[PDB]
RNA sequence: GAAGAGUUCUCUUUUCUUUUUAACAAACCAUUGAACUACCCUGAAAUCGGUUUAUCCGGAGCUAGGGUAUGGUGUUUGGAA
């Protein structure tokens, strides 16, 4: 299966936050299990998000597709630069 | 409104003139006129919203709420009656 389907599954039944500021909050709290980073993300931000994840022992997936594709992949009609998944629910993302 | 003047068969509570306030200094300031202009904080937006005369803006963080800065040929005064 593709990550888009897993992302579509985990948003039907699951927990998530969208965007940079909310992602940092879940990484700080320790409830972020997996963060998805858009392919065209700012290069400095990617280093910061990767560092936050390593400190909180969360997985990072730099998956191909821009913030436009990531926004579409979550079913939203706006660009998404980074996702944080606190709960897969019924999906097999983790 | 006031002071003076012009006209006045008749009419005209009339017509005309004067009724000013500098550099500089201080405190405020989007109030009273011009800002959500830029930035920050909270928060996280699809039933998408905000918004200009001019359609641009937002998960790279909208709307909203509260702040910070920019400051006079503005205000209140000193100067200055």
From Swiss-Prot:
Pfam families, sorted: Ribosomal_L7Ae
Keywords annotated in UniProt: Cytoplasm, Ribonucleoprotein, Ribosomal protein
The keyword Ribonucleoprotein appears for this protein: yes
Organism, scientific name: Schizosaccharomyces pombe (strain 972 / ATCC 24843)
Subcellular location field: Cytoplasm
SUPFAM superfamilies reported for this sequence: L30e-like
Similarity comment: family membership: Belongs to the eukaryotic ribosomal protein eL30 family.
Any one Gene Ontology BP term: negative regulation of gene expression
Summary of subunit composition and partner proteins: Component of the large ribosomal subunit (LSU). Mature yeast ribosomes consist of a small (40S) and a large (60S) subunit. The 40S small subunit contains 1 molecule of ribosomal RNA (18S rRNA) and at least 33 different proteins. The large 60S subunit contains 3 rRNA molecules (25S, 5.8S and 5S rRNA) and at least 46 different proteins.
Other noteworthy facts: There are 2 genes for eL30 in S.pombe.
Protein name (database record): Large ribosomal subunit protein eL30A
Main location: cytoplasm
Top-rank taxon, per record: Eukaryota
GO molecular function, one term: pre-mRNA intronic binding
Role description: Component of the ribosome, a large ribonucleoprotein complex responsible for the synthesis of proteins in the cell. The small ribosomal subunit (SSU) binds messenger RNAs (mRNAs) and translates the encoded message by selecting cognate aminoacyl-transfer RNA (tRNA) molecules. The large subunit (LSU) contains the ribosomal catalytic site termed the peptidyl transferase center (PTC), which catalyzes the formation of peptide bonds, thereby polymerizing the amino acids delivered by tRNAs into a polypeptide chain.
GO CC field: cytosol; cytosolic large ribosomal subunit; preribosome
């Amino acid at each position: 299966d593709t990550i888009n389907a897993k992302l579509a599954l985990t948003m039907k039944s699951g927990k998530y936050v969208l965007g940079y500021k909310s992602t940092l909050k879940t990484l700080r709290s320790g409830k972020a299990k997996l963060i998805l980073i858009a392919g065209n993300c700012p290069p400095l931000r990617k280093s910061e998000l990767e560092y936050y994840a390593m400190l909180s022992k969360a997985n990072v997936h730099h998956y191909a597709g821009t913030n436009i594709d990531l926004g579409t992949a979550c079913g939203k009609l706006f660009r998404v630069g980074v996702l944080a998944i606190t709960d897969a629910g019924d999906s097999d993302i983790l």
